[PDB]
Every structure is written in C-alpha cells, then in structure tokens.
Design a protein around this ligand. Sequence first.
Ligand SMILES: Nc1ncnc2c1ncn2[C@@H]1O[C@H](COP(=O)(O)O)[C@@H](O)[C@H]1O
Ligand SMILES: [Mg+2]
Ligand SMILES: [Mg+2]
Length: 460
Amino acid sequence: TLSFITRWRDELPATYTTLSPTPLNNARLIWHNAELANTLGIPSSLFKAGVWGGETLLPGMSPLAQVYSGHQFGVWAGQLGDGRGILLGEQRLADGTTMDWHLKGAGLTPYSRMGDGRAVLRSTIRESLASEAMHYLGIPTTRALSIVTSDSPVYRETVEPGAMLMRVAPSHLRFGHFEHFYYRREPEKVRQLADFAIRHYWSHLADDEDKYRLWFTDVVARTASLIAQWQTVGFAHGVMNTDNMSLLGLTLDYGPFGFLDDYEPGFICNHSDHQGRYSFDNQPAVALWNLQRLAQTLSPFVAVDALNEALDSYQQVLLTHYGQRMRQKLGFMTEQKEDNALLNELFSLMARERSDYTRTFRMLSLTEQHSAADEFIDRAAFDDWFARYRGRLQQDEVSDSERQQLMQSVNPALVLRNWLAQRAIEAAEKGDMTELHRLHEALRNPFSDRDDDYVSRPPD
Ligand SMILES: Nc1ncnc2c1ncn2[C@@H]1O[C@H](COP(=O)(O)O)[C@@H](O)[C@H]1O
Ligand SMILES: [Mg+2]
Ligand SMILES: [Mg+2]
C-alpha cells in the first residue's frame, strides 16, 4: 500500500553504497509520531521493532548510504558521508512529493570512519523533540517518525542504550554533496546533482533558461529565510558545517542545538565549539560563508558573476524575513521609522539584564497601549523604554485586543528548553515514556498558553 521509488539509486550512481541496516539487540519501539504517520499513509499496524529498528524492509525500499564531504568548523575535513544512517527509500505521497526515509543509527557504513555507526537514546530523543518543535513553529525542518531503543551498549562519555531515529525529509541533499565531487575534480557530477535537484524540487525552472542562476538565487533565499527564522525564535544550531546545510533550506542534524533562554547573542551550546564559531549571533554570517563555499562548487558551469549576484541578495532577503517577523513579534502592525531604534534598544537592554528570550516576548504580547503595567535590575530604564515603545503602538490604529492576538500567534508560549528534554530523557531511560509523549504533545501547540511547568524557567 505504500509507494517507494528508487530515484536517487537509479539517477545518481556512484554517490552511495548499497547496504542493509544492522539491527540492535532486543530493539523495541518506544515512541512513534502518530499524526505524521497518518499524513504519510503508513498503516498503524506497522507499529505493532521491524522497519523502525532496521530489522525488516518494506517492499520497494532499496537501502543505501550516501557519500558526501564537508568543511567542519571552517576547515576542509575531506570525505564524510552517511556514517551512521541509511536512506531506506524514497516514498511518493499523493500530492506528488517524495519523502526520504532515513534510519539514523542503523549501523556501520563505508562512511563511518572510526565511529561505531550508532546513536544513543538521549540524542535521538533530543532530535525528535526539536525537529517536531521546529515544525509546529512553522520553520522548515526534517521530521521525526519513530524512536527505537535497545539493550545494546553504546559508549560515549558513559555507557548508553543504542537507539535509532526514523527521520523523514523531502531530501537529504547537503551543501557537502556538491563540495564532495567538486574537490574530487569531478565537475560533471556536481552538475548532475544540480540537475537532479532542479528536476525534482524546482521543476518550474524550464530547462536551460537561466536555469542555474535562478536555482542558486533561490537556494540563497531559502537559507537566508531559514536563518532569519532561527534568529527570531532563539534557535542555535551549534554545528553549521557545510555538510549539515540542507540544499532545500530545512533545519538539518539536531546535535548540540539550543533554544535560547537568557538572551545571549554569543550563546554557545556546542561543547567542542571552542572559538564560538557557531554562536547564536554568528549564524547569519556563518550561513553566508557556507553559501559562498557552495557557490565555489558551481563555478565550473555557472558564471562566477551570477553566483556573486545571488550571494549579494542574501542580506536583503535575510533582513526582510527577519524584520517582518520581529515586527509581528513586537506587535508593529504598520511601519514607523522609530522601529529599528526601538528594537535595538530592547535587545541591548535584554542583553544587559539577561532577560529570558521566549518569556520576554510572550509577556510583551500582553501590552496595553495606554497602560504602563519587574523582571529587571534597572526598572527605571525599562519604564523609559516601555513608554517610548507604547507611544509608537498608538500610531498603529489597531485595538489592544487582537494586536495581542497577533503577537500571541508569533510569540510562542512554550519552546523546547534543554531541561524539558532532559526530564523526558531521564524518565525514558528508566522505562517511563510518559514524559516524552507528554512533551511531544505540548510542542504541537507552542502558541497555546499553559498551566504547567512547560513555560517556566529552568529551576537551576
Ligand atoms: N557514532 C558515529 N559513528 C559513525 N559515524 C558518525 C557517528 N557520528 C557521526 N558520524 C559521522 O561523522 C560526521 C559528522 O558530521 P557533523 O554532523 O558535521 O559533526 C557525519 O558524516 C556523520 O555521519
Ligand atoms: Mg551531520
Ligand atoms: Mg550531528
């Protein structure tokens, strides 16, 4: 009843190795995304480890591990690849889409290098939670379909349970795919990848008419738009290597990510990021550097000037998405020239007071235009800003009522803070999945107001 195709396998030879998953010991399904499975047409009976732990294949699957390369922390790292995941197959849906089924943690691969080919329970739970949270925030992302755990030992800093995440995504094409064949001096493979991407994901681009220029221009636009969205909700990726940049502009590879709590422009959650290369505030600059590295691979067949003209549009596109989203976050229904100084004043104020990001904007969503109605060390400086802020809201013509309603639709009540995920991971390891299911449910309504500790500070 499910339709899989062998598109990547048939059309992109020599980009992969065919292999099957390596099952874990006593693997069992612990969580599956019931909403997504209905969207995908998956029979519910399939969840009663099977395919979710790589122990069986569904008809039409032809599993393979893709090769790719990357710049890691700004330095060429050579060949990477699907070192601990398997593309099981590509599913065609009724709307004409294809969805990759990628099993993360499926075992050793020719691209595992010196790693064990496994994932652990805590990292797969964090990835599932964050990817689902990002989707309900309206931010392009890979999706999480299932998690299996096992009694198989996997060693990181402690001994942990081996686990697998079934990831689904429209594509796993990364900037690092193009780099891989460019620095192998195989410029025709690079063009083949670009042609494959345009044929399946940009099919309105009529063949040859400025094909690659308009395509790359749009690739720049989607990555600028993704970063703008991260910035407004306080998402720090942590590992923006070129092999983790989705060509389509989806959030990809959830490792040492972090949703901002205290507002900290130079916030770093990657423990190995010594220089803060992937600090929250460098994400705009880093994404542009990643696009420049992609632009280098395309120069064999795209005029180097049209490449730089696409790269020059990055800042305006990022600024437009960012500015429009923040103005909704600030309740600015029109556009006054007081708006930039007002925001810059708030952020510099928020950074000196270490205000909680999500809470600051959610509380600001209760603002009444004519009312001046204590989380700051310098209340005098807030009332001064809050007054000049409120005077600008008066110009907006619009009511108190549904200015607050617009703000509550763009300022989340709940985000996935590190301590919420950790609580679900702890209970999960003890064999209690209630907190993991509870947290998943809450994250499907990030803009609803809450009674419980899902909107609170980390206890500390
Ligand atoms: N436990 C593991 N075993 C084998 N390969 C891994 C493991 N963890 C990560 N890798 C691979 O190492 C690379 C790290 O990429 P990054 O996400 O940029 O840090 C990717 O190619 C991964 O597939
Ligand atoms: Mg990765
Ligand atoms: Mg990773």
